Write a structure and sequence with these properties.
The protein is an alpha/beta fold and about 250 residues long. It has a single domain (about 1-250), classed as Vaccinia Virus protein VP39 (Rossmann fold, 3-Layer(aba) Sandwich). Helices cover about 35% and strands about 25% of the residues. The chain has helices at about 5-20, 40-45, 55-70, 110-120, 135-145, 190-200, 210-220, 235-240, and strands at about 25-30, 50-55, 75-80, 95-100, 125-135, 155, 170-175, 185, 200-210, 245-250. A seven-stranded mixed beta sheet has the order 3-2-1-4-5-10-9, with helices on both faces. α1 packs across α7 (about 210-220), α1 (about 5-20) crosses α8 (about 235-240) and α4 crosses α6 (about 190-200). The N and C termini lie far apart (about 45 Å). It binds S-adenosylmethionine. S-adenosylmethionine binds near residues 83, 84, 100, 102 and 105. The PDB classes it as transferase. Keywords: methyltransferase, rna, cap, m7G, messenger rna cap, transferase. It forms a monomeric assembly.
């Protein structure tokens, strides 16, 4: 309830990102789909097929039930397995692969990233898109130097301290009110990701902050913002949102 505005913003930004790169009849691969909280959005986008994969079976179960009890016009496929740290082959390619708030979990180890990036590339049609919303390392480290790493909504803690380079930390503890609790998150090594994808044929095409994206997309057209309880984010709510950023790659 206290995080309603934050959830509306994230869902909005997600709907805008989805509406920006998807077209009628497209096939989508939702990595880390979770409880399938995007099935509604894709249903509006008019996509023809949706495939959701998540490591947590408890979340896939919710998504199955939701897809089962929703007025959808597209075929749905669900599978509970590790799509990042384990070889995956669904046997087909998709026009768009989305990963909202979960791809950073692919940065467990160099091997986990290489495996994950390879799974995305073999399931992406030539000219296909790979959309994602992941935490921003630069943003996080900047707030570390500022001394403010939390408020009434979130809380972040880094790794070591005793003679340990600030740029050396590769993971942290994230906590969100009425959500994750002291969850282990892995930093996103942008450079390694870019170079890694560039090697598989995927090039970077977009990278924008949640706030700027939020404001821009919210002005480009009119209130779709009317639908959801959107409006004016407070400074405190903006700190939680201003944590993530949008990143898009295209298979050239
Ligand atoms: C914040 S939740 C996603 C919620 C949903 N995507 C959305 O945008 O509302 C992150 C998800 O990442 C998934 N995840 C974490 N590690 C994963 C892995 N190795 N393979 C697949 N999914 C993974 C979890 O099971 C969790 O449901």
């Amino acid at each position: 309830s206290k995080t309603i505005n934050i959830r509306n913003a994230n869902n909005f930004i997600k709907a805008c990102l989805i509406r920006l790169y998807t077209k009628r009849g497209d096939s989508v691969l939702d990595l880390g789909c979770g409880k399938g909280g995007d099935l509604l959005k894709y249903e509006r986008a008019g996509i023809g097929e949706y495939y959701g994969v998540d490591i947590a079976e408890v979340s896939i179960n919710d998504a199955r039930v939701r897809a089962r009890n929703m007025k959808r016009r597209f075929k749905v496929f669900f599978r509970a397995q590790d799509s990042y740290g384990r070889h995956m082959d669904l046997g087909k390619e998709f026009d768009v692969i989305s990963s909202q708030f979960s791809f950073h979990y692919a940065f467990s180890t160099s091997e986990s990233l290489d495996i994950a990036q390879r799974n995305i590339a073999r399931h992406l049609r030539p000219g296909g898109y790979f959309i994602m919303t992941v935490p921003s390392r630069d943003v996080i480290l900047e707030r570390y130097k500022q001394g403010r790493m939390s408020n009434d909504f979130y809380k972040i803690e880094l790794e070591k301290m005793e003679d340990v380079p600030m740029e050396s930390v590769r993971e942290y503890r994230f906590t969100l009110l009425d959500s994750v609790n002291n969850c282990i998150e892995y930093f996103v090594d942008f450079t390694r990701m870019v170079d890694g994808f560039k090697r598989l044929g995927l090039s970077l095409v977009e990278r924008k902050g949640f706030i700027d994206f939020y404001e821009d997309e919210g002005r480009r057209n009119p209130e779709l913002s009317k639908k959801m309880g959107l409006g004016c984010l407070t400074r405190e709510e903006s700190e939680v949102v201003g944590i993530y950023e949008v990143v898009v790659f295209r298979k050239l």
